[model samples]
Target: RRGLGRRRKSWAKSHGFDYEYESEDLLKRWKRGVMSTVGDVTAKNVVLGQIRGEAVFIFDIEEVATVIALHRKVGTNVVVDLRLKGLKEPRENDIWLLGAIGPRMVYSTNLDAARRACDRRMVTFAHTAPDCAEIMWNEQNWTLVAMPVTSNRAQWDEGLRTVRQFNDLLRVLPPVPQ
Candidate 1:
């Protein structure tokens, strides 16, 4: 059953969110606890060089070419966060271009862009803050929702709890099959 462990249908139904695995091989490794998430490109290069079963979350889209090349070489999937400096909203074309570069997912606070990305067959994640939970919940269509951990540990602790609760309600499952 090399490719039959947990089909996407059951996983998506359980999570109330659809997700795309970087690769079937990578998904298998993740199921074995051999995979993890990486914060950014710099960390991936400085601390861990192209390790297998790692996912990169890119908050900055400045050096797109470099990031794409690095991710390709390292065999890691990339998720781009679109809430960067001076880039409050991204156009549909921009989302399309990013998708062309091979990012598996796009995280954005802009609902329009997120939806457009989803339409383009790119997995979309909605980024929200604690203050806007209701707003996000009302307008949600993305695959996943994430909250950033802020400077205040106490605030982040609360946010983490909220995130966990949200995930629980959604029946979110682990990224890999058990």
Candidate 2:
């Protein structure tokens, strides 16, 4: 009664993009441990596209439960990501941290070390993202990406808006709150 592909391609073709597939060979070259630095990773029905000159991808992430995983992820993976080429930074910027905002759990490698470094962005980022979505910035590719559960079209559209907003948020000082 339902199919995500019909929903996915319609969004892409209408928007002037072609379909993209994520492959095992593709994953080896991309190297994002958060997505899987090696293999044993699954990125299905992945749709690759761009935003603000950087590549942004929407795929169903974390479909199955994971018992264990690793750190040191990098992404030159397209549909997987694009370069944040001109992104400037604070000393602690560009570190990877996953904010699964609503359910309220943080994911990271050196979680303790990170809190001491880039803690400011977490507060700033949380406000911009909706509760259902998950988000992170990949250092290797210099891109900001999000986890959008793409079970349907409307949900994916919501995810796209969130990513676009994240890019917009980066451009400004994120307000100088006291």
Best candidate, lDDT: 2
Which window of 10 residues has the lowest lDDT sum in candidate 1?
27-36
Across 1-178, the per-residue lDDT of candidate 1 in tens digits comes to: 1222134234334434333432222222111000123313221111112213222221111122111111221111222232222222233232222322122223433435334434422222223334312111101111112233221323323433443333223222112223
TM-score to native of every candidate shown:
0.23, 0.52
Report lDDT (Cα) of residue 109, candidate 2: 39
Give stretches of model 1 more than 4 Å off. 1-40, 43-129, 132-150, 172-178
The residue-by-residue lDDT of candidate 2 on 58-139, one tens digit each, is: 5543453111111222332211111122222112333344333433334333444334333456445555455444433433
Q: Which residue runs does candidate 2 get wrong by more than 4 Å?
A: 29-34, 61-124, 142-150, 167-178
**How high is the lDDT of residue 19 in model 2?**
55
**Model 2 CA lDDT for position 119:** 46
